[PDB]
Tab-separated table of C-alpha atoms and ligand atoms in Angstrom:
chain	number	residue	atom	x	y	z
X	1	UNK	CA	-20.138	114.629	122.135
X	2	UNK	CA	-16.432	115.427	122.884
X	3	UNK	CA	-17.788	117.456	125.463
X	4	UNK	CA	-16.955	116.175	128.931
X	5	UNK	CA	-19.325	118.665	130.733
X	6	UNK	CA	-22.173	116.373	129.160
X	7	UNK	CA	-20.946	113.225	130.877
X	8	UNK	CA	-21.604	114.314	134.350
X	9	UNK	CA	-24.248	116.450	136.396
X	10	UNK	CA	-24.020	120.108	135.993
X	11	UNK	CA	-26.648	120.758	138.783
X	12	UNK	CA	-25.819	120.703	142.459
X	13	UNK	CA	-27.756	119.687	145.151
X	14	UNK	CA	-31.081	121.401	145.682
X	15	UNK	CA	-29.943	121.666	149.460
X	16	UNK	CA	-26.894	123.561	148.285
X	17	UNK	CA	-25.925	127.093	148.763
X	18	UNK	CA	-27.729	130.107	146.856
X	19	UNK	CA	-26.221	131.128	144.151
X	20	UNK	CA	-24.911	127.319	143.042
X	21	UNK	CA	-25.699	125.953	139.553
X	22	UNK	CA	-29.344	124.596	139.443
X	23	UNK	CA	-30.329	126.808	142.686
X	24	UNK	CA	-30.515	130.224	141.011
X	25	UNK	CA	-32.977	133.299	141.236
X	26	UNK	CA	-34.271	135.229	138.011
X	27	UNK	CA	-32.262	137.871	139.392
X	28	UNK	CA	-29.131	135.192	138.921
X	29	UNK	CA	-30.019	133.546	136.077
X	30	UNK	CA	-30.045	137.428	133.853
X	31	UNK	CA	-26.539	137.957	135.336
X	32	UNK	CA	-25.462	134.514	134.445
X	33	UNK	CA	-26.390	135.319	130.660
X	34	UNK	CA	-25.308	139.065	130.892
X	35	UNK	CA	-21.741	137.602	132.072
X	36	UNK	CA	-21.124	134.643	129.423
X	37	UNK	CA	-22.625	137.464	126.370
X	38	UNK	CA	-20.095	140.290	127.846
X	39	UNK	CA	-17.003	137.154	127.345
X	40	UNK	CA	-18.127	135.857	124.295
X	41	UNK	CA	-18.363	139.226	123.085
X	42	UNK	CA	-14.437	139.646	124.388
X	43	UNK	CA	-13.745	136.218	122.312
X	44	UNK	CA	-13.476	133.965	125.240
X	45	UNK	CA	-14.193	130.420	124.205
X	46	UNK	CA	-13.235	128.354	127.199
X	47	UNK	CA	-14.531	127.642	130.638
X	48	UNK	CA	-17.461	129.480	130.012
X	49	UNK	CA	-19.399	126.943	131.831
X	50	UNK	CA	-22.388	127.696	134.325
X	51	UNK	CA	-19.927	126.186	136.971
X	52	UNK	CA	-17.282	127.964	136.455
X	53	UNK	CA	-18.875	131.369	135.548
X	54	UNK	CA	-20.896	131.083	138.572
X	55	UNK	CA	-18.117	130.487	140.885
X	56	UNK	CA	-16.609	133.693	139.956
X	57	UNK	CA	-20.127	135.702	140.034
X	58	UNK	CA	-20.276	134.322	144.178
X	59	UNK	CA	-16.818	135.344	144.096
X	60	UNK	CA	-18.316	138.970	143.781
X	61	UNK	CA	-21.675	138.591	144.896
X	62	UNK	CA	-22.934	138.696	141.101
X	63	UNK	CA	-21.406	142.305	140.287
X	64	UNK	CA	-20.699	141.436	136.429
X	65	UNK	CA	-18.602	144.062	136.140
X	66	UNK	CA	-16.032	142.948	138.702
X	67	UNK	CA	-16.775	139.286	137.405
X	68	UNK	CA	-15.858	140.317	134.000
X	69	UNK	CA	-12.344	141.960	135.281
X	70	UNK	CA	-11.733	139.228	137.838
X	71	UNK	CA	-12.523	136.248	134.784
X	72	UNK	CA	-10.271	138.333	132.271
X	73	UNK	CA	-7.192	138.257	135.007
X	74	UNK	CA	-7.391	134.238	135.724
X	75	UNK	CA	-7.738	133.479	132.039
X	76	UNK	CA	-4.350	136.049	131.705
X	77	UNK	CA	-2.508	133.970	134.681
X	78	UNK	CA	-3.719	130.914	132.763
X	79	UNK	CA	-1.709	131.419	130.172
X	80	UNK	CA	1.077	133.537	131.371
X	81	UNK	CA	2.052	131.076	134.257
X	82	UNK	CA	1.560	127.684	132.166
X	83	UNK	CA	-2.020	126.619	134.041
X	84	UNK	CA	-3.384	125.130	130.538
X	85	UNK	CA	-0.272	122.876	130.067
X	86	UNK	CA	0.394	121.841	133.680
X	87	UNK	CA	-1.292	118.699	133.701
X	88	UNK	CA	0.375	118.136	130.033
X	89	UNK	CA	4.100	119.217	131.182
X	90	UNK	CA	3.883	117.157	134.266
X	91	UNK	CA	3.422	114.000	132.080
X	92	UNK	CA	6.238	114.962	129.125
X	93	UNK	CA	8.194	114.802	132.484
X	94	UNK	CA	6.476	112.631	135.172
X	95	UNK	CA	9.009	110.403	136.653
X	96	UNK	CA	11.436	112.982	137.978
X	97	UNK	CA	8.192	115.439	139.273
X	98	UNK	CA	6.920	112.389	140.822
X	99	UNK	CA	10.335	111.438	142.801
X	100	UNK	CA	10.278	114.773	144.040
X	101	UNK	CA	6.824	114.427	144.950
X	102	UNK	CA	8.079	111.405	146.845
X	103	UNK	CA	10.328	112.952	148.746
X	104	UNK	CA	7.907	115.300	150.666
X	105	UNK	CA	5.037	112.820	150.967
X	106	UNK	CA	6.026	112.035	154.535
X	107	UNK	CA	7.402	115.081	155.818
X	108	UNK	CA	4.211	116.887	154.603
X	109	UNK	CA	1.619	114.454	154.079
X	110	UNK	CA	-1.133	115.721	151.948
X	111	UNK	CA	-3.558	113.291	150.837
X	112	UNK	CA	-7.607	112.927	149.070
X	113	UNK	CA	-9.546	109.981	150.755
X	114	UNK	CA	-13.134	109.247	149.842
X	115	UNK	CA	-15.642	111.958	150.084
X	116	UNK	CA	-18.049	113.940	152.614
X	117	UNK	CA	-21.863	113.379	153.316
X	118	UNK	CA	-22.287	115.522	150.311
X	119	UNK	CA	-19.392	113.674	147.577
X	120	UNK	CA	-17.354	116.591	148.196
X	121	UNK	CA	-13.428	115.120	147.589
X	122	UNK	CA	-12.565	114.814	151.229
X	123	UNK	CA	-9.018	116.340	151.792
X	124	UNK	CA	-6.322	115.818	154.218
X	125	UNK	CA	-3.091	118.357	155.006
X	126	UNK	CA	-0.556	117.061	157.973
X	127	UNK	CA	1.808	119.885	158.830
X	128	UNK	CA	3.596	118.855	162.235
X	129	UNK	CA	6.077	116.955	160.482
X	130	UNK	CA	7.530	119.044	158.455
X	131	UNK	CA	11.122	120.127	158.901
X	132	UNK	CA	11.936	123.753	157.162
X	133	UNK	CA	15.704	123.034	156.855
X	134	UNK	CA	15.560	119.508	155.302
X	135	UNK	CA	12.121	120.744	152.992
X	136	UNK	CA	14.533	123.885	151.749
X	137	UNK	CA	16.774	121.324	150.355
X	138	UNK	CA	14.338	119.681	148.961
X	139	UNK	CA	11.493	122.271	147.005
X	140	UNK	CA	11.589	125.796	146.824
X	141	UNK	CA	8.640	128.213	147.349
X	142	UNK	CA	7.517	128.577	143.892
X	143	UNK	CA	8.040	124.574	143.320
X	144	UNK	CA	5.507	124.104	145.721
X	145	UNK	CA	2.747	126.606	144.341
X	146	UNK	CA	3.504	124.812	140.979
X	147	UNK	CA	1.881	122.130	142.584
X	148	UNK	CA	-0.912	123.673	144.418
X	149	UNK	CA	-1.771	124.750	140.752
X	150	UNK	CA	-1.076	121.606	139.476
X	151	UNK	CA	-3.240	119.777	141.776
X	152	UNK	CA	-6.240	122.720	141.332
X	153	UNK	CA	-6.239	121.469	137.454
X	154	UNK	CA	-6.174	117.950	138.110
X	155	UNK	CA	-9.129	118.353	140.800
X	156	UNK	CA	-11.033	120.242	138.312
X	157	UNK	CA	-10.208	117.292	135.634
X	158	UNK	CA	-10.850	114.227	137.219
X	159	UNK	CA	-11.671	114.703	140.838
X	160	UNK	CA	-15.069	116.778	139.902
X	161	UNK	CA	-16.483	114.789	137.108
X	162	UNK	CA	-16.086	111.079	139.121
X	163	UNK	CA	-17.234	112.707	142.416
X	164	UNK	CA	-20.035	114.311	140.861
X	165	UNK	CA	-21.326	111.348	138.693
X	166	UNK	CA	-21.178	109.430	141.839
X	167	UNK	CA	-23.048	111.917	144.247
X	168	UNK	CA	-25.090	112.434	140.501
X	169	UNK	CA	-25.268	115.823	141.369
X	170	UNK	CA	-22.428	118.881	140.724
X	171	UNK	CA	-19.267	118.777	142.932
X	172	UNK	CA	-17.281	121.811	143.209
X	173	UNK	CA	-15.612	121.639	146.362
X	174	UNK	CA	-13.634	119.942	148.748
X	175	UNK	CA	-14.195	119.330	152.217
X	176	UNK	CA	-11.123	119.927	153.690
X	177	UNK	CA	-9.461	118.520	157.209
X	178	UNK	CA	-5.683	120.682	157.967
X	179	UNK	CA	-4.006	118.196	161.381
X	180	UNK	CA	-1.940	121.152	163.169
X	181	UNK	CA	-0.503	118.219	165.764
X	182	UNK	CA	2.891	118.735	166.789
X	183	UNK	CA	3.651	122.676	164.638
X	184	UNK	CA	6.120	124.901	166.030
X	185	UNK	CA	4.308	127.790	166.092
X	186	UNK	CA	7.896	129.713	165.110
X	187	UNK	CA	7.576	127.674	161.796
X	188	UNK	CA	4.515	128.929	161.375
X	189	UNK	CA	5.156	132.669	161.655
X	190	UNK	CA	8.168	131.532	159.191
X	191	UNK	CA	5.988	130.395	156.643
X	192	UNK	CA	3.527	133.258	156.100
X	193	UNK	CA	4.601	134.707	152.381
X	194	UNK	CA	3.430	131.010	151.457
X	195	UNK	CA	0.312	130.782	153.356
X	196	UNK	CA	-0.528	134.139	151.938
X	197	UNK	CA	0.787	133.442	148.641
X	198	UNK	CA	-1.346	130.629	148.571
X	199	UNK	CA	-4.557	132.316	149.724
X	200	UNK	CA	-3.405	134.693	146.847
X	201	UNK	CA	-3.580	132.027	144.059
X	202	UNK	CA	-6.578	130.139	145.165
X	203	UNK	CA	-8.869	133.405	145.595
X	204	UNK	CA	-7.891	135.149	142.458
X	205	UNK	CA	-7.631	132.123	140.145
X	206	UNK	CA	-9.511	129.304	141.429
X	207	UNK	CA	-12.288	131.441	143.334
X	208	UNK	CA	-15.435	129.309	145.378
X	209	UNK	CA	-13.801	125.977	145.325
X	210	UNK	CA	-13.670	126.011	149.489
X	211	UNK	CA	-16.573	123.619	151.028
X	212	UNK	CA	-15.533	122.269	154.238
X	213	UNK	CA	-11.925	123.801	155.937
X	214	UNK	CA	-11.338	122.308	159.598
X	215	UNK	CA	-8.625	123.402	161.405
X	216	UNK	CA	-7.767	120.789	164.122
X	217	UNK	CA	-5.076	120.221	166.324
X	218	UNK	CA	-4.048	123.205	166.685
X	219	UNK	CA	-1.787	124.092	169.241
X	220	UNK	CA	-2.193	126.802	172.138
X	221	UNK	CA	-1.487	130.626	170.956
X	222	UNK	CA	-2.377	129.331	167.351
X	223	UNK	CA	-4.993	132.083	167.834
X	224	UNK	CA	-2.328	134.480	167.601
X	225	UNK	CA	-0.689	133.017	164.570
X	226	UNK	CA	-4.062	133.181	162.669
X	227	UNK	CA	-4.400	136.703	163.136
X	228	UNK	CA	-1.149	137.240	160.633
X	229	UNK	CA	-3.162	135.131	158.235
X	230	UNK	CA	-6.866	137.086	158.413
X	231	UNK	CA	-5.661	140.337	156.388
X	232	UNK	CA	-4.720	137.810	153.730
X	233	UNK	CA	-7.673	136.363	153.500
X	234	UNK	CA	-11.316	137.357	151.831
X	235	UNK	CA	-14.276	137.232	154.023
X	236	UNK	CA	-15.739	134.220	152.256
X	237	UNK	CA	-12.916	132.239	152.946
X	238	UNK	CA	-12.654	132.960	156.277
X	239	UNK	CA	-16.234	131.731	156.525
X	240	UNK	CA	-15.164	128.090	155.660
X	241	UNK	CA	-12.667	128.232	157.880
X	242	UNK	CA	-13.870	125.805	161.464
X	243	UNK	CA	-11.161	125.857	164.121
X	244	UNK	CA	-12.627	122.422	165.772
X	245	UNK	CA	-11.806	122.087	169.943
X	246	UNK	CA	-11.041	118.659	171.788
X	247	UNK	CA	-14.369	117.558	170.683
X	248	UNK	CA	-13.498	118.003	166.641
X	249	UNK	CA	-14.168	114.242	165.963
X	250	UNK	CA	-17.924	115.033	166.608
X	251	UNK	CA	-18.339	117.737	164.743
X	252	UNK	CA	-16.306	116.274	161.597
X	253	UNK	CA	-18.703	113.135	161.890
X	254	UNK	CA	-21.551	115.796	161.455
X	255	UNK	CA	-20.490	116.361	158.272
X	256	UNK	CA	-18.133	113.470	157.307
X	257	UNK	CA	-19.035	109.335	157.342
X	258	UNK	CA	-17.418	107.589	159.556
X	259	UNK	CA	-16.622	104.795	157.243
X	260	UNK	CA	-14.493	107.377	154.997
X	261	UNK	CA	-12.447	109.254	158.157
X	262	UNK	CA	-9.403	107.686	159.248
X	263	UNK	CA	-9.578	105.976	162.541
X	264	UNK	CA	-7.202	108.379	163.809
X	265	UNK	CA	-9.255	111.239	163.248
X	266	UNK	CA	-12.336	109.741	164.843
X	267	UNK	CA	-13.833	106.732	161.649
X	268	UNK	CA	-13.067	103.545	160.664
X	269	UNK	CA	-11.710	103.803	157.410
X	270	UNK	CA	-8.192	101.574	157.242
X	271	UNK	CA	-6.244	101.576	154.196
X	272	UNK	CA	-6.442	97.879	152.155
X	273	UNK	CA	-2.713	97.095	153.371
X	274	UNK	CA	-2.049	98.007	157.576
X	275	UNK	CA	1.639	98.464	156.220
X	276	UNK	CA	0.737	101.156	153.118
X	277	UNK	CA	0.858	104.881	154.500
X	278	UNK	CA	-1.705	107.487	153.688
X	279	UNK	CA	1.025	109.939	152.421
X	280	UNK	CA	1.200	108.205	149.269
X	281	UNK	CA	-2.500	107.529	148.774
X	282	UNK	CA	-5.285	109.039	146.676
X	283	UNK	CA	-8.650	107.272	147.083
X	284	UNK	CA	-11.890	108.052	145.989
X	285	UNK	CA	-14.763	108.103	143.295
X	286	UNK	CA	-11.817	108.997	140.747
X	287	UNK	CA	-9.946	105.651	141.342
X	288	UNK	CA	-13.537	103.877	140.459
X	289	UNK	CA	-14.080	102.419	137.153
X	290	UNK	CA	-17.747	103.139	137.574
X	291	UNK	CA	-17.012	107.007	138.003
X	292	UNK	CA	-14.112	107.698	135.786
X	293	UNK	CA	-15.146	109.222	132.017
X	294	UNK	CA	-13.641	110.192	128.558
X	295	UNK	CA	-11.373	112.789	131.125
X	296	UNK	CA	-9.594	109.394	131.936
X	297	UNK	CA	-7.941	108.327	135.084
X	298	UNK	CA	-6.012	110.413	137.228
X	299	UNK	CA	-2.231	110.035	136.754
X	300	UNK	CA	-0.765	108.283	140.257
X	301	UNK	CA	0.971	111.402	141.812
X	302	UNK	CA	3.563	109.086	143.809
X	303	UNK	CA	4.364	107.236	140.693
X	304	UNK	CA	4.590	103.790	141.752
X	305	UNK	CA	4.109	104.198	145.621
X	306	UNK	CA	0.613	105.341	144.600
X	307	UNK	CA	-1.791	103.868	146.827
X	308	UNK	CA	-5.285	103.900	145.676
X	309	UNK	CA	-7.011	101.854	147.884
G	1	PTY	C1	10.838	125.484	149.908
G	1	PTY	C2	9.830	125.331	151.030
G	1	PTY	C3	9.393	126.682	151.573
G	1	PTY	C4	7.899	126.892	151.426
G	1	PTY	C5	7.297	127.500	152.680
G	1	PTY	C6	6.185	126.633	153.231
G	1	PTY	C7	6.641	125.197	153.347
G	1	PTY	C8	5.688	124.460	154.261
G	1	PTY	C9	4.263	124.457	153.737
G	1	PTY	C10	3.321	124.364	154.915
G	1	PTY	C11	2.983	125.737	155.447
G	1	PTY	C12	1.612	126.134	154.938
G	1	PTY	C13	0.607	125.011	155.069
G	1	PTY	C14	-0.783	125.548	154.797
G	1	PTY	C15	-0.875	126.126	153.394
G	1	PTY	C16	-2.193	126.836	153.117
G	1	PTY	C17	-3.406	125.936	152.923
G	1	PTY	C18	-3.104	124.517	152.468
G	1	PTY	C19	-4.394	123.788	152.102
G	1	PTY	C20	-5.005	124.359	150.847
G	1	PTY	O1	-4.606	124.134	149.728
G	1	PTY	O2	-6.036	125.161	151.102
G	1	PTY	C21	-6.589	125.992	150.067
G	1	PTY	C22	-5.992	127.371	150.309
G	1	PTY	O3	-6.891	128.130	151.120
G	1	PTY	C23	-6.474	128.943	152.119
G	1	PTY	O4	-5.922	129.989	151.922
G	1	PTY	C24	-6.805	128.417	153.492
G	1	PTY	C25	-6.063	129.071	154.647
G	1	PTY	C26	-5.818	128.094	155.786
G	1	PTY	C27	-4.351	128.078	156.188
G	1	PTY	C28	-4.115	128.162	157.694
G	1	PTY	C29	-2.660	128.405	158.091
G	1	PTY	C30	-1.937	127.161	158.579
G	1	PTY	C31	-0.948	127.462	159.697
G	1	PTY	C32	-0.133	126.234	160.077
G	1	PTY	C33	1.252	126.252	159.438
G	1	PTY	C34	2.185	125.209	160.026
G	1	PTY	C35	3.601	125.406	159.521
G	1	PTY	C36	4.560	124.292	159.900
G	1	PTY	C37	5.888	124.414	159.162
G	1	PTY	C38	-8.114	125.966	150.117
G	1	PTY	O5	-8.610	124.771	150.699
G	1	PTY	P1	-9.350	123.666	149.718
G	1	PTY	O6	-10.332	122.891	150.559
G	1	PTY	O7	-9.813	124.365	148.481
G	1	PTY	O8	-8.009	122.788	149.446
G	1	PTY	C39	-8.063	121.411	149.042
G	1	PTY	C40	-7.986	121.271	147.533
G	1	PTY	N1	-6.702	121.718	146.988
């Protein structure tokens, strides 16, 4: 076929959210059709996909009109900020992005291991290590949303096809787990043109890709701190968003298996070798023969600290 999109499921779940590929009303299905005639009128050829045009119709609860403008601007960005060639440019020059890559793995550990009840990619961020002074030296701001992008093109490319021919329905989403332990809540205020910068990029350019977002950990007066972040974030998002108590290893095995969440954050799950660190790991459907298609495997993002299972 040449067509990846035929290789995997392009239905979700029947128990899914309204509005999600295979789960449509009439009503939906019209505005689906109106949207992908109005871009291929335009000459848009790619991504035209029910997945991805329906992520930006949620995005703006099916108003085509703001669809259409809010489709036109990503595929814009796209190609004025180097989003169809990241994947390509990291490769042409993978060892010394990788050895940076390195370098912040422990200081900021950020890590994909297995999946949710549903397949989603479960996702884990670990921000009370980090160290603003030694990270400066080390990445600047920009750097670091280069690989935010980066990382939103290779979920897209191999994370979604293997974890959706192994739940064999769609995945589009991540079920994310953020550890606040240990933050200095000054670092925090210090950080907010990146939170917000962030937020930026991910709701204007990769819109409806939130699932799951636990906040745990977090320390007391984070409350505070949050309410700089709000005005920077759209509603939707700030629907995902679960600030879990001292009980949050109950309420992420509602929605997580224990056998996939780290012991430390309430499972079983142990990494293959005791010694190997989950900072330089990436585990899941995508590392699975049995899951990965004609996208090919993922490229190891530590180089050769990659730990995969
Ligand atoms: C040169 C270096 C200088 C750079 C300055 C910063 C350096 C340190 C970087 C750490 C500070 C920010 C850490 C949080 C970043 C924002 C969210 C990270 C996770 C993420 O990608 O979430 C996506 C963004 O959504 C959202 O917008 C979700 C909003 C939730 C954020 C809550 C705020 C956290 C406050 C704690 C900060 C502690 C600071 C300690 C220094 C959506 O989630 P997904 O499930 O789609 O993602 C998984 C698939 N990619």
């Amino acid at each position: 076929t040449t067509s990846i999109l035929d290789t995997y499921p392009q239905i979700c779940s029947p128990n899914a959210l309204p509005g999600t590929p295979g789960n449509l009303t009439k009503e939906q299905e019209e505005a689906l059709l109106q949207f992908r005639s109005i871009l291929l009128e335009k000459n848009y050829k790619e991504r035209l996909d029910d997945s991805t045009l329906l992520r930006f119709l949620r995005a703006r609860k099916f108003d085509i009109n703001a669809s259409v403008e809010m489709f036109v601007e990503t595929e814009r960005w796209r190609e004025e900020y180097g989003a169809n060639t990241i994947i390509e440019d990291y490769e042409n020059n993978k060892e010394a992005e990788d050895k940076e890559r390195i370098k912040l793995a422990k200081m900021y550990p950020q890590y994909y291991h297995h999946v949710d009840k549903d397949g989603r990619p479960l996702y884990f961020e670990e921000l009370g290590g980090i160290n603003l002074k030694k990270m400066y030296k080390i990445t600047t701001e920009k750097q670091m949303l280069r690989n935010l992008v980066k990382e939103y093109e290779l979920f897209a490319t191999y994370r979604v096809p293997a974890c959706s021919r192994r739940a064999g329905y769609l995945i589009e989403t991540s079920c994310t787990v953020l550890d606040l332990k240990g933050i200095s809540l000054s670092n925090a205020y210090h950080v907010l043109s990146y939170i917000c910068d962030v937020a930026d990029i991910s709701q204007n350019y990769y819109p409806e890709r939130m699932g799951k977002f636990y906040i745990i950990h977090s320390p007391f007066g984070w409350s505070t701190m949050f309410k700089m972040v709000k005005p920077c974030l759209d509603p939707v998002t700030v629907s995902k968003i679960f600030i879990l108590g001292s009980s949050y290893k109950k309420e992420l095995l509602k929605q997580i298996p224990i056998e996939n969440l780290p012991v430390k954050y309430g499972g079983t799950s142990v990494l293959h070798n005791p010694n190997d660190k989950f900072y330089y790991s990436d585990i899941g459907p995508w590392r699975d023969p049995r899951y990965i298609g004609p996208e090919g495997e993922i490229p190891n993002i530590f180089g050769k600290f990659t730990v995969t299972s």
